[PDB]
Design a protein around this ligand. Structure first.
Ligand SMILES: *[C@@H]1O[C@H](CO)[C@@H](O[C@@H]2O[C@H](CO)[C@@H](O)[C@H](O)[C@H]2NC(C)=O)[C@H](O)[C@H]1NC(C)=O
Ligand code: NAG
Lengths: 161, 107
């Protein structure tokens, strides 16, 4: 791959049933304030409720699309209900080929960047005319931006200081 | 169900699991909302669970079939247990002749 074209597939504003603007951490600082990975949305409960999410995006572009998403693994049972209410959650992802179902694993973990929680990130290539389908109870790190693959050719990742 | 390989030959056994479209279809086909398939042999120790999700329609199906296999050696037994979503074997293949071969890609 020689060129990506970033596009928005699921707007940040369109999460009218969940809190999409409080998904930040001191582990990801920006100009002295708590921030987060800009291309994905850390969704949490709104007014003490996390209703089931059911979102679909259809690849209407000519280009193959690289889609990124994630799952949050919390520190303990208290933090789970604190962020998402529901004690047992999941994320199910489907495409033409893909048939995924993720569940958050809870455990006591060492503090990296002052966090005992973890983020596990996943990806897929959504081919043209195919649709990706999400469903979740919580712990969902939703895509906002995905990358179009516009130019394919000779390239390499070169390790150098 | 249990099958005992009484043949002299190694046996190729095939089975599967059905992944349904939604919770309604699960109870519609199999009643039980939470199911599994457990498979055991001399070596094998498997337990499959159906994963549910909204999926694109390939050949007009939102459901999926995931297929599995094993080689059941002579004098060994294969054991199945399931609540639903089980795609059970009917026929399996005896391996009678082993030798030089290849799968050749050609139109
Ligand atoms: C069926 O599987 C059993 C074990 O799950 C196999 O064990 C044979 O069983 C008898 C015991 O009644 C032994 O005397 C034999 O030595 C075993 N046979 C061989 C050839 O190893 C059982 O053999 C299998 N059934 C058969 C061969 O009919
Ligand atoms: C959306 O995807 C479907 C199949 O998943 C496809 O048939 C359809 O043409 C796409 N939508 C368009 C072109 O508006």
């Amino acid at each position: 791959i020689n060129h990506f074209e970033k596009i928005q597939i699921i707007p940040k504003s369109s999460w009218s049933s969940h809190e999409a603007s409080l998904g930040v951490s001191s582990a990801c600082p920006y100009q002295g304030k708590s921030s987060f990975f800009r291309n994905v949305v850390w969704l949490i409960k709104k007014n003490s409720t996390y209703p089931t999410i059911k979102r679909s995006y259809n690849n209407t572009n000519q280009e193959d699309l690289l889609v990124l998403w994630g799952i949050h693994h919390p520190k303990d049972a208290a933090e789970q209900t604190k962020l998402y209410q529901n004690p047992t959650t999941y994320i199910s992802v489907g495409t033409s080929t893909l048939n995924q179902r993720l569940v958050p694993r809870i455990a006591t973990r060492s503090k990296v960047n002052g966090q005992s929680g973890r983020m596990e990130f996943f990806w897929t290539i959504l081919k043209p005319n195919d649709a990706i389908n999400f469903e979740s109870n919580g712990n969902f790190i939703a895509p906002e931006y995905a990358y179009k693959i516009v130019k394919k050719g000779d390239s390499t990742i070169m390790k150098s200081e």
